[PDB]
Amino acid sequence: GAPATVTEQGEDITSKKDRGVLKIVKRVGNGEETPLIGDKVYVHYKGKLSNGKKEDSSHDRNEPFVFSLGKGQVIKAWDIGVATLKKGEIAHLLIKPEYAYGSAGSLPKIPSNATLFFEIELLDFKGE
Ligand SMILES: COc1ccc(CC[C@@H](OC(=O)[C@@H]2CCCCN2C(=O)[C@H](c2cc(OC)c(OC)c(OC)c2)C2CCCCC2)c2cccc(OCC(=O)O)c2)cc1OC
């Protein structure tokens, strides 16, 4: 499925080049600018456990998910991955646990050593 396609075709966007965060651009965005640390970022997303069975989406609440980029407000893979997106871009991320919840997990929601998959649409971003 989509996770396997990211393994096969995804770009390694980690600094260590350990393939811990792999990305496919599914829809190209506009212009050249990508968000800076501190920017208010607005996204729609769907996230799941790649193996396990748990599913989460901002469409559930039918409102965008908002966070400040690069402040450790979200898992490391998002700070890394969303920084590489343009406005209007949709991307797939496959995320190994080292860039998510690691060995601790976040039980009951997230098991230990879990791989996560997300589809993320970057709606907009703004300086404060
Ligand atoms: C720096 O590390 C962390 C920082 C924050 C967290 C909490 C989960 C953090 O979620 C995440 O970082 C990732 C990426 C963003 C969308 C949500 N997300 C999740 O994993 C989802 C998620 C969604 C949640 O509710 C919306 C969670 O409840 C807080 C949650 O808790 C562990 C996890 C998963 C749900 C199961 C299926 C796979 C996805 C979170 C959730 C809701 C709002 C958040 O920030 C907005 C703000 O604070 O205004 C941050 C975990 C962190 O690492 C373990």
Numbering used by the authors: 13 to 140
Q: Can I see the authors' text?
A:
Two positions, K58 and K60, were identified as promising anchor points for lactamization to the residue in position 67. This was expected to trap residue 67 in an out-like conformation and stabilize the β2-β3a-loop by a seven (i, i+7) or nine (i, i+9) amino acid macrocycle. Protein crystallography of the ligand-bound proteins confirmed the desired 3D structure of the synthesized and refolded proteins FKBP5116–140 F67E/K58 (i, i+9) and F67E/K60Orn (i, i+7). The protein fold, the ligand binding mode, and the conformation of the β3-strand were identical to recombinant FKBP51. Notably, the side chains of F67E/K58 and F67K60 were well resolved, which unambiguously confirmed the desired lactam bridge and its F67-out mimicking conformation. In contrast, for the lactam-bridged variants, fragments resulting from cleavage between F67E/K58, F67E/K60Orn, and F67E/K60Dab are undetectable because the covalent bond formed protects the protein from fragmentation at these sites. Lactamization within the protein was expected to shift the conformational equilibrium toward the F67-out-like conformation. This should result in a higher binding affinity of conformation-specific ligands, as the energetic penalty to adopt the F67-out-like conformation is reduced. Indeed, when we compare the Kd values of recombinant FKBP5116–140 with the synthesized and cyclized variants, we observe a 6–10-fold tighter binding for the lysine/glutamic acid cyclized variants.
Here we used the FK506-binding protein 51 (FKBP51) as a model system to evaluate whether chemically engineered proteins can be trapped in pharmacologically relevant conformations. FKBP51 has emerged as a promising drug target for chronic pain, obesity, and depression. The major challenge in FKBP51 drug development is selectivity toward its closest homologue FKBP52, as the binding pockets of both proteins are very similar, but the biological functions are opposite. Selectivity for FKBP51 can be achieved by targeting a transient conformation characterized by an outward flip of phenylalanine 67 (F67in and F67out).41−45 This conformation is rarely populated in the apo-state of FKBP51,46 but enables high selectivity vs FKBP52.47,48 To stabilize the transient binding pocket of FKBP51 (F67-out), we aimed to lock this conformation precisely by the formation of an intramolecular amide bond (sites displayed in Figure 1B).
